[PDB]
Amino acid sequence: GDRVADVIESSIGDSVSRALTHALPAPTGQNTQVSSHRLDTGKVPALQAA
Amino acid sequence: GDRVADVIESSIGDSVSRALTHALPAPTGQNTQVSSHRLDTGKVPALQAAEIGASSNASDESMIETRCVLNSHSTAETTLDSFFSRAGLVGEIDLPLEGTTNPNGYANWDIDITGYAQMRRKVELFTYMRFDAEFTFVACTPTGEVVPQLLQYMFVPPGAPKPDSRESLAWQTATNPSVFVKLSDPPAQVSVPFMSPASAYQWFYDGYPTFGEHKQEKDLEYGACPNNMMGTFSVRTVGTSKSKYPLVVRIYMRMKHVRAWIPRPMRNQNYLFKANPNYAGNSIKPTGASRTAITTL
Amino acid sequence: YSDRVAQLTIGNSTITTQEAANIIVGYGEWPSYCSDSDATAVDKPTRPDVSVNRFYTLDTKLWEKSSKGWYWKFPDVLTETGVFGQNAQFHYLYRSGFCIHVQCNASKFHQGALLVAVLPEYVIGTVAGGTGTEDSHPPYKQTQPGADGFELQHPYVLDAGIPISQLTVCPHQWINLRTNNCATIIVPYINALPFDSALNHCNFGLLVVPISPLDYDQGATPVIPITITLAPMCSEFAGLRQAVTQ
Amino acid sequence: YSDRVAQLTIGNSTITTQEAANIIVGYGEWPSYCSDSDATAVDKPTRPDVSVNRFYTLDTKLWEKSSKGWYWKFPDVLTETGVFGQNAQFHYLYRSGFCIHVQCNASKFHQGALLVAVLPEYVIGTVAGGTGTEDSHPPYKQTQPGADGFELQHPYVLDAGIPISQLTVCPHQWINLRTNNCATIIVPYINALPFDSALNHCNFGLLVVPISPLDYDQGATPVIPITITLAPMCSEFAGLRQAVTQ
Amino acid sequence: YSDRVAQLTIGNSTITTQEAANIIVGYGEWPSYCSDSDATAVDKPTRPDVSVNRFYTLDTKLWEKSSKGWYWKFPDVLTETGVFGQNAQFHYLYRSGFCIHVQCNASKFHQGALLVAVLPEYVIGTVAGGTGTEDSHPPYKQTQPGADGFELQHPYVLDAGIPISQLTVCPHQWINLRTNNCATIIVPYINALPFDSALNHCNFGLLVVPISPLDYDQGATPVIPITITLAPMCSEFAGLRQAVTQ
Numbered sequence A: 001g002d003r004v005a006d007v008i009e010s011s012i013g014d015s016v017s018r019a020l021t022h023a024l025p026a027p028t029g030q031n032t033q034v035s036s037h038r039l040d041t042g043k044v045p046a047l048q049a050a
Numbered sequence B: 001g002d003r004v005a006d007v008i009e010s011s012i013g014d015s016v017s018r019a020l021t022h023a024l025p026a027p028t029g030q031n032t033q034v035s036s037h038r039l040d041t042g043k044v045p046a047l048q049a050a051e052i053g054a055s056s057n058a059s060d061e062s063m064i065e066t067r068c069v070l071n072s073h074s075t076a077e078t079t080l081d082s083f084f085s086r087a088g089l090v091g092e093i094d095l096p097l098e099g100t101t102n103p104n105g106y107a108n109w110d111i112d113i114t115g116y117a118q119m120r121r122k123v124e125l126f127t128y129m130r131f132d133a134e135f136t137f138v139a140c141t142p143t144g145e146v147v148p149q150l151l152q153y154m155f156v157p158p159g160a161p162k163p164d165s166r167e168s169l170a171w172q173t174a175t176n177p178s179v180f181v182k183l184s185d186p187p188a189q190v191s192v193p194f195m196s197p198a199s200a201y202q203w204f205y206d207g208y209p210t211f212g213e214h215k216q217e218k219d220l221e222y223g224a225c226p227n228n229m230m231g232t233f234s235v236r237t238v239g240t241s242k243s244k245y246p247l248v249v250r251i252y253m254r255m256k257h258v259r260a261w262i263p264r265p266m267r268n269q270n271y272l273f274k275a276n277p278n279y280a281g282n283s284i285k286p287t288g289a290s291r292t293a294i295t296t297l
Numbered sequence C, D, E: 001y002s003d004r005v006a007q008l009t010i011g012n013s014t015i016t017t018q019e020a021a022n023i024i025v026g027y028g029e030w031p032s033y034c035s036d037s038d039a040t041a042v043d044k045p046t047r048p049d050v051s052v053n054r055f056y057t058l059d060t061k062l063w064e065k066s067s068k069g070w071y072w073k074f075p076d077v078l079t080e081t082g083v084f085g086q087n088a089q090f091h092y093l094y095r096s097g098f099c100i101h102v103q104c105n106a107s108k109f110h111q112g113a114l115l116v117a118v119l120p121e122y123v124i125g126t127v128a129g130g131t132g133t134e135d136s137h138p139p140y141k142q143t144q145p146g147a148d149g150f151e152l153q154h155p156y157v158l159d160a161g162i163p164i165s166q167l168t169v170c171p172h173q174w175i176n177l178r179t180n181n182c183a184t185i186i187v188p189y190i191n192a193l194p195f196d197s198a199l200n201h202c203n204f205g206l207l208v209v210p211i212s213p214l215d216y217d218q219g220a221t222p223v224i225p226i227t228i229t230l231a232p233m234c235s236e237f238a239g240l241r242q243a244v245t246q
């Protein structure tokens, strides 16, 4: 139609830099919550891929 | 309890064929929606497994940034009716004055669509076909000259008396259809209904028509389904004294109200015989042209 | 849930597989019993169910590094096998679809790809005397091989003038050794008639043929067998008589 | 859904991968066009879009068992390549981010790990006459190698006094042969200016360098190539003039 | 979520695994502290928690191609190890369950299967002089081997007249080299008493024994070790006195 669609939708000229992360306040060092034992399958924090 | 449960639940005798897919309307070619760049993990259209047995579902909108296209290209030309409503050569009947061939102005032709590759291969694309037909009969001399002769075409369905003479008693045609044309008149044209005992004609019968032992004698009857053997075709002079002119009759078939069913690969070897897919064994040809190297054009 | 792990239970038979492709439903149409509007015979058919509707292991070919490929003609494969074939002999009319499970597995250091295909009305032609001037016809052992099946004369041409180059039209499934180890095809009763002889006529033909050749180094396994398994679905028989064979 | 299987489609280019790590978004910030508040040039820039925003395959190094590692300087790599480089030559001002897809695959019996890194303003220093008493400077072929790239003099020091021991600060991604076979880095336009020359200034530098050496037994493949692919995103050009080069 | 990837964190210990079977909960019953209705001692027990409730690596046997299998007797394995054993010595009464993580990994070209089993009250018998006419008894080093454990005299008979042919009754878990590389068994305090001596009595016995032998070609690794790890859960000690040992 009028005008062409690939111009209407087109994101050309998008001004604002899309933020993947926002800043949080850290006046103090992070506090530590209490923890207990955990013997489960699937939940595995230690294993990671560098 | 009463009655037994494995009969109550049992799906034995389920009549309707469970449809995995329904047909949608496609008057125009598919339109193309606009596309943008995509850099994601998990969404991957291009990667597919041909092992499955399915065709590539990957659409062009997800392989390249595309514009909008309002496609209005019609798909009508690509339909079974508009693809088969083309009259093609299916028979040539010769009536010479004196030769090896039929010399008494009466020829009999057991009706076989094949024997002419172009009309055959087009038709051999499908295994089962159901259609009405429109037959045209062109009569002339071997030079193409038009002469004042009077022919009689007669349709002889299976079991009906076949003519054994130019002046046979079967030419009374008290029941079976026959047509009286002059060569002066334009080609005779006749509409024909679908008259197989089966729901469709078969271009392929993977079996024998008879029971018992199949020794090397009755081995030529392999692939013979009488359901699409619709009888014989006969021509007269007409009598009673022999004709004065050499004659040639060409039969043309046009299909209408066509309904083919299951698709078939397409012949790549020279046809050699009627109702028989034999081929020259030492002269096996590739399906298409060939080049010198795969890295050159 | 996963796509490649499958299990097929019919009657008292059960096939498991962990490295498969998705199941093909033939022509997008599940096998079914014959309606009272399609049928024409007035006889009340027998639907033996479990006894005949089950998997049959009928052959096992050895896929050698240079093989042309084989084929089988259905339903002539079972005619002497099990209680299915018994019903197919004592009766004149028969109706069924099949669940073909072709299977072939190797290591991860093997390579090659099979092509499983179900070609309806697979009529077989002969080499016409090598020159083309002989209207010879195939023997009974070629058109109706049965149990052991038949090796192709030439694989390019499908022994019928038609090219294997476009066999993937009719319901097919590849067995590519680096991804899957079995193919599964479910076909319905494909015929222009509601019933047929089952002895004289063969509804279709299974074409197991390699396109990319089997290959392997000097490993510890050179014997790689392809095994054919099938199972009649919604089987019906009518026109009872004496036991008749080939 | 999965994390390692990815597809990257830009313009008329498309990259597939089945054994990858997750995509890195540079500094947690997607590439964008220049605002009317950051810009200063009054010219109406050209944003050619599809024609220049697409993947380019520019080099393929052979990862030998004893290699020091290589680098490329952006955006001098494309200046003579495609219709991107054409715009970068006829214009004075340029702006774009990139989508770098470094790729290198081997068997499961190979081992080794690459380190893909995007270091902004990668200024290169020289060995000061071996002794330290010579203020020499690198040639043009070292600071702006372009297509073929440049092999490191010394890899420990990054040819600039800085240690590779802490290069994983700036956006990086490892290519460890036993887990992934490709790295992907998306960077935005990283500069203190809204636009720059693209010929004189180089926004950053791609550092492909192995830390754990490639190794393999006497197998059947010793030629393991690393291939560099990149794609400009949100490209803008301003200040039109005649075609100018290096 | 997945079934084979697991992590076990107790106290300041942590075990990771990527190729495991699901965790067995002994007799479908999680370990617990002793109620005030089951207990009989009036002493206020010590429940040291973290210090003693943690993983201990106590032994590592070498699984050779022809090994009969080994066993350990609990809780005599820890009596000289850590701050758990300290509490078990200074006290008369003890109560705890365990979290046994037997571990053994090889390549994909290795084969073999271990059988990890927890058999409560595993009393050991002797070969009665070969003929059967001698009421001999096992030494201390056989009934209470401790750290290094003991190799079976005969594995078929479990050195007690009982058959290993039916050991999979009591909580077990296979270590089949082609699927898993570790077993995990969580047992509660299994005894007819709320507390026991921990030195004199042994609540159960860990039986690590191969049924399908380890095998491998002339590869690059013939040393395949099995490693035993355990962790006391809900530990209680009562009846304080001087330090006493074996």
Ligand SMILES: CCCCCCCCCCCCC/C=C/[C@H](O)[C@H](N)CO
Binding pocket: B111, B112, B113, B114, B133, B135, B153, B154, B155, B177, B190, B192, B201, B202, B203, B204, B223, B224, B225, B228, B229, B230, B233, B275, B276
């Ligand atoms: C007035 C004369 C009209 C003649 C009517 C004839 C109509 C016949 C319809 C075509 C039937 C199918 C043709 C036969 C199939 C093949 O030729 C072979 N049987 C293949 O085996």
